């Protein structure tokens, strides 16, 4: 009765409030503090208008910075991609009931593909699936994925893990930890952006350390 009203409000509304630092985001009962820090630099690295002679980050990710078919998105987009990835990683990989997977799938697709703050859920089979258990399941698995991201080390030349890849049917999300912060990038499922000769498309952005450090 009341449960549905609340569960819908929380899952189907990605609230964004503009602030001095950047944005205040609220979704699925979770607060996030997104910021502009790094985005200034991130643009200069791609267009190649920076002071120093070279950049270590620009060299490590040429499929992003030296790719004419890549484009930069906002930190809000970065957050959505991580959230979408958290759902896709922890949950959808296991074998669970099909209407639940389709529900999580739709929600991750809404986060990943669009920039809309409201999700008008028109698929009916899913709409009935929306429970407090479902919300609870998402919340915990978002937190797990964030802790999993916090466990990453900054890109290095040892054997220490520094990134995470999530491969869906239609996408490949890669989140790598750098000195700037978490470099979030979205490629085609065949990773066509890596093709050095004729590089495929890729959206990417930065999520600053601070946003995740609140949870750790």
């Amino acid at each position: 009765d009341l449960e549905k009203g609340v569960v819908l409000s929380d899952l189907c509304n990605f609230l964004v409030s503009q602030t001095i630092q950047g944005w205040k985001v609220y979704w699925a009962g979770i607060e996030f503090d997104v910021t502009h820090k790094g985005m200034a630099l991130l643009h200069r690295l791609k267009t190649n208008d920076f002071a120093p002679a070279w950049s270590m980050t620009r060299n490590l990710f040429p499929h992003l910075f030296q790719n004419p078919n890549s484009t930069i998105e906002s930190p809000l987009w970065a957050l959505r991609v991580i959230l979408a990835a958290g759902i896709q990683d922890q949950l959808i990989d296991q074998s669970l009931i099909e209407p639940l997977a389709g529900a999580l799938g739709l929600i991750s697709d809404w986060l990943l593909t669009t920039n809309t703050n409201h999700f008008n859920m028109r698929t009916q089979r899913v709409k009935e699936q929306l429970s407090l258990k479902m919300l609870s399941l998402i919340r915990s698995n978002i937190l797990k994925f964030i802790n999993k991201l916090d466990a990453l080390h900054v890109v290095n030349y040892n054997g220490l893990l520094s990134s995470i890849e999530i491969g869906t049917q239609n996408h490949t999300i890669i989140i790598t930890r750098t000195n700037m912060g978490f470099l979030v990038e979205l490629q085609e499922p065949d990773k066509s952006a890596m093709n050095r000769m004729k590089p495929g498309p890729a959206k990417f952005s930065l999520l600053h350390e601070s946003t995740l450090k609140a949870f750790t």
Binding site: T114, N120, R122, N170, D190
Partner: protein, 170 residues
């Protein structure tokens, strides 16, 4: 560069181990499926569409793109009999899957293919006054995925998406 006399020649090539072959085989089928109604019927008679739809889900992306083009071309120039056959094989879900991809070109192909199926439902509604393929698209999460495309960047996609919702759904 090479020619074939028989059509079931390609049925073998679509089930090869090499992706590079399968991809180019699908590209060839799409050219045949782009033709007239008898040419489409030839492909139906050789049992090619069943393996195309299997490819459209299971195969890697570059191959799926050409398999998609092939099926959308069938729905474009195909007869009411031929389109119903594709739907019976279960091509709507495979098409709805493509709606969320990054490549705008492939999204438009999926939208056209779905529209072709939906416009056929307008005729079928006159012949229970309801479009049968609306229910099937909703159940394949297509309705929501089309809803997403209303807010898409590309003009040609978001106008098509708005049109489909107003005309057939909302």
């Amino acid at each position: 560069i090479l020619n074939c006399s028989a059509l079931p020649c390609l049925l073998h090539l679509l089930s090869s181990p090499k992706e590079s072959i399968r991809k180019e085989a699908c590209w060839t089928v799409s050219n045949i499926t782009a033709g007239n109604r008898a040419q489409i019927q030839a492909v139906i008679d050789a049992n090619i569409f069943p393996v195309l739809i299997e490819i459209l889900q299971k195969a890697e992306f570059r191959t799926r793109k050409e398999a998609a083009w092939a099926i959308t071309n069938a729905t474009s120039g195909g007869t009411p009999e031929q389109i119903r056959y594709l739907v019976a094989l279960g091509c709507i879900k495979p098409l709805c899957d493509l709606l969320t991809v990054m490549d705008s070109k492939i999204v438009q192909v999926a939208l056209n293919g779905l529209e072709n199926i939906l416009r056929l439902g307008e005729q079928e509604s006159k012949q229970i006054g309801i479009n049968p393929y609306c229910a099937l698209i909703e159940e394949a999460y297509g309705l929501d995925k089309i809803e997403f495309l209303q807010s898409h960047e590309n003009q040609e996609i978001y106008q098509k998406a708005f049109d489909l919702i107003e005309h057939y759904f909302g």
